[PDB]
Amino acid sequence: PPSFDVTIAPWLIARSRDVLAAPEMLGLRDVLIRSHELSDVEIPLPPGAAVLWRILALITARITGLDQPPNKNPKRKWQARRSQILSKGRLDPEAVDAYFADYSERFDLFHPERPWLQDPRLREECPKTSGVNKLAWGRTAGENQVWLGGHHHDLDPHPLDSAEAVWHLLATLGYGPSGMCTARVVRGRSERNVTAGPLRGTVSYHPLGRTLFESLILNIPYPGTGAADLAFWEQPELNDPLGLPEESAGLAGILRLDHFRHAVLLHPSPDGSHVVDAWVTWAWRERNISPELDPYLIYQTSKEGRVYPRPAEAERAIWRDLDALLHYGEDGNYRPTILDNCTPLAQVPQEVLDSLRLRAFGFDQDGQARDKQWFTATTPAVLRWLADRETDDNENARIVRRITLARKAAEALGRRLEKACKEAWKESNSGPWVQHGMSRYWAKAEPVFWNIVYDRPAQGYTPGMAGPGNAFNLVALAAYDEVTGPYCERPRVAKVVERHRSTLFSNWTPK
């Protein structure tokens, strides 16, 4: 029978901390056990990476972290403990096999009974099949138009590699459209609709270090003390489509791995290394918001008391690795809690912290069913090089002070410009300018950033001074002034555009 278990089957692109030549495919247990030998692991899809890194962190926390706080000043003692595992250096192989021993039967993707994070009952009970196209991302589904991402005419379905199948699967199981999916007949009841993904339209922030090991344990959020729960593949009995999803205070319920809003399935091929058909449909119909908000995302509060994740923006990805630099700052309410409990000094890491790097997996999308773009963002190691190469304490501090300053002020004027354009266009008619203004603003303002980091003569301000010298502010005046320039001719638009244009002039600290 066809079978494919993530334990030993190679599906993760992994590369060691060595030469950095010829990286190759590794399974889950293999990349975990010898993580100490591997630099890092990755998969081409940033959504699939944002969920992959969550299950990896949850596994390493199932064995390494022990994902269970003791009871004597728990938080503190826990930080100590994990600092000891970090001090050791690697994983215990008998612990890895000791954890799979309890679940060696769970990880098969094509298990004929209770597969890996799929719904076996959904095999029957579904009149039609959703098709592999809907499972694969960037691939034309039934109603989409066949222009982009390679033609796929709903027919001659190019079978996907089981690796690509677990990538797209793991991503769709995370980020997922909302609305009009394949119908299911539950207990004689049919309901064709589906809810959105839990992480849909949000940027994720995962810290990464020199070796994959410290990255894994640094990606361990403090397990909220509570009723110990299990991830999706550990539950002994398959969930009920009706009924309220089980509640979980434990990390398995805060990493969004206890219950998913979707339910996919892979139809195996006789060969066993290809998927031919798939099923994508609703798994839970009654709404439920997850308590103990996600530590990876950045959350911002609106009026009325609701807290929501800051949505992604392709406009920020116009320059590479923009959000990656959040390790500087930090920043005013704009900081994930996982970082707020693993990057600072109130924890007990000693020297891996001096080589920590941030990474960001973002996939901007509309909250209903329309997708726009994905992008990864790994911080530039050069910004570390500059701080280390000089070996002068006062200069080592002046450089990082210059990067922190330039970054903070950069995004400050970015958002100040956003509200400037939103009020300018919303008041001109009594918007479409934000897209152009922001895109051109970051695209133009990042070479200035690299211009300030190398203390080279930048626009507006020459090297030598303390901080950013108030230069990209002038870059914001440039972008804003040109995006709305040809339209501020008549006095109406001129006076409103100007009235909102007299804000960029602040902070604006003189010479």
Partner 1 sequence: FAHAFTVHGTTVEVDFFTAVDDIPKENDHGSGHMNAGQFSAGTFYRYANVNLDRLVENTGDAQTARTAVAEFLRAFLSTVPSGKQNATAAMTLPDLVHIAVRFDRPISFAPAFETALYGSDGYTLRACQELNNYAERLREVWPDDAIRGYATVENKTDLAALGERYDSYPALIDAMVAAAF
Partner 2 sequence: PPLDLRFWAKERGLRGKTYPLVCHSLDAAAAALVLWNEYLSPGLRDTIASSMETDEEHAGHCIAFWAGLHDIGKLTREFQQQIAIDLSAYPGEELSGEQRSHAAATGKWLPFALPSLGYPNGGLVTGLVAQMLGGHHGTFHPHPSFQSRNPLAEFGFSSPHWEKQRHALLHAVFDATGRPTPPDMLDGPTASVVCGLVILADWLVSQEDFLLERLTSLPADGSASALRAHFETSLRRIPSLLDAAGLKPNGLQASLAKHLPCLCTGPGLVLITAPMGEGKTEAAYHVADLLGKATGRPGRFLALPTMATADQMHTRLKEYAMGRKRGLLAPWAVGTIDQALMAVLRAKHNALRLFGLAGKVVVVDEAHAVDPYMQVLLEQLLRWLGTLDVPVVLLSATLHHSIANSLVKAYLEGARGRRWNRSEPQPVSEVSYPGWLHVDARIGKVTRSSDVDPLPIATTPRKPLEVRLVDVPVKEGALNRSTVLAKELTPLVKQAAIICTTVAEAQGVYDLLSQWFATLPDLYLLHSRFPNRQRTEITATIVDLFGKEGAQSGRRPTVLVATQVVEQSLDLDVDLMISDLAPVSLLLQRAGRCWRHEHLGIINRPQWAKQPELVVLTPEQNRAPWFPRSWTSVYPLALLQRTYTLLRRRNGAPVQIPEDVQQLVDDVYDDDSLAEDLEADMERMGEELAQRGLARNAVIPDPDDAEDNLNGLTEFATRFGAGSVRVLCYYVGNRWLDPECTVEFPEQGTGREGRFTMADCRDLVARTIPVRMGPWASQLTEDNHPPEAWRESFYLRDLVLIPQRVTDEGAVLPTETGGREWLLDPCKGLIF
Chain residues binding partner 2 by CB under 8 A are: 69, 71, 73-76, 79, 222, 224-228, 242-244, 247, 249, 286-293, 299, 301, 303-307, 327-330, 333, 335, 337, 340-341, 343-346, 354, 384, 387, 393-394, 396-401, 404-405, 408-409, 465-468, 470, 507, 509
Question: In the bound complex, what is the minimum distance in angstroms from residue 479's beta carbon to partner 1?
Answer: 18
Minimum distance from residue 482 beta carbon to partner 1 (Å): 12
Find the shortest distance in angstroms from Cβ 74 to partner 2: 5
Which position has the token pair 């379905």? Answer: 157
Spatial distance between the Cα atoms of 176 and 263, rounded to a whole number of angstroms? 10
Q: Which is nearer to partner 2, 31 or 448 (CB)?
A: 448
**How many angstroms separate the CA atoms of 44 and 40, rounded?**
13
Minimum Å gap between C-beta 459 and partner 1 is 22
Q: Which of 486, 491, 510, 511 binds partner 1 (CB under 8 A)?
A: 486
Is position 299 an interface residue for partner 1 (rule: CB under 8 A)?
no
Nearer to partner 2, 46 or 223 (CB): 223
Nearer to partner 1, 338 or 488 (CB): 488
Residues 231 and 258: their CA atoms lie apart, in Å, by: 5
Give the residue with the Cβ less far from partner 1, 37 or 481.
481
306 sits near partner 1 (criterion: CB under 8 A): no
Pick the piece of the chain touching partner 1 (CB under 8 A) from 184-192, 353-361, 364-372, 482-490.
482-490
Task: Give the phi and the psi of residue 93 in degrees, each rounded to 5.
Answer: -60, -35
CA angle 165, 167, 172 (to 5 degrees): 90
Residue 369: other Cβ atoms inside 10 A: 15
Query: DSSP state, 457?
Result: -
User: With left for phi above 0 and alpha for psi between -120 and 50, is residue 249 left, alpha or beta?
Assistant: alpha
63-68 long-range contacts (CB < 8 A, ≥24 apart) are 63/91, 63/92, 63/95, 63/96, 63/98, 63/99, 64/91, 64/95, 64/216, 64/217, 64/220, 65/217, 65/220, 65/223, 67/220, 67/223, 67/250, 67/251, 68/223, 68/228
Q: Which does 490 bind (CB under 5 to 8 A by kind): partner 2, partner 1, none?
A: partner 1
Closest distance to partner 1 from the beta carbon of 493 (Å): 9
Please choose which of partner 1, partner 2, none residue 142 contacts, taking the beta carbon within 5 to 8 angstroms, the exact cut-off set by kind.
Answer: none
Dist. CA 420–CA 505, nearest whole Å: 12
Nearer to partner 1, 18 or 489 (CB): 489
Least Å distance, CB 480 to partner 1, is 18
Q: How far is the CB of 303 from partner 2 (least distance, A)?
A: 8
Task: Using CB under 8 A, pick the residue from 156, 304, 351, 489 that binds partner 1.
Answer: 489
Name the nearest CA neighbour of 470 among 437, 510, 417, 441. Answer: 510
Report the residue number, 224 or 431, with the smaller CB distance to partner 1. 431
Is residue 430 close enough to count as binding partner 1 by CB under 8 A? Answer: no
Q: Select the binding partner of residue 80 from partner 1, partner 2, none (C-beta < 5 to 8 A, by kind).
A: none
Is residue 487 a contact residue for partner 1 (CB under 8 A)?
A: yes
- What SS3 state is found at 78? helix
Considering only CA atoms, which of 179, 174, 170 is closest in space to residue 141?
Answer: 179
Smallest distance, partner 2 to C-beta of residue 244, A: 6
Contacts of 237 (CB under 8 A, 6+ apart): none
* Listed residue (55, 6, 51, 54) closest to 27, CA to CA: 6
Nearer to partner 1, 158 or 492 (CB): 492
State the minimum distance, in angstroms, from the CB of residue 368 to partner 2: 19
C-alpha 10/C-alpha 29 separation (Å) is: 10
Question: Residue 12's beta-bridge partner residues?
Answer: 26
Which residue type is seen at 301?
Answer: T
- The C-alpha atoms of residue 59 and residue 99 are separated, in whole angstroms, by 9
Q: How far is the CB of 319 from partner 1 (least distance, A)?
A: 25
94 binds, among partner 2, partner 1, none (CB under 5 to 8 A by kind): none
| Closer of 154 and 482 to partner 1 (Cβ) | 482
Q: Are 51 and 174 in contact (CB under 8 A)?
A: yes
Query: Nearest approach, Cβ of 465 to partner 2 (angstroms)?
Result: 7
287 binds, among partner 2, partner 1, none (CB under 5 to 8 A by kind): partner 2
Q: Would you mind telling me the total number of residues written for the chain in this entry?
A: 511
Q: In terms of CB distance, is 405 or 494 closer to partner 2?
A: 405
Q: Which residues bind partner 1 (CB under 8 A)?
A: 486-487, 489-490
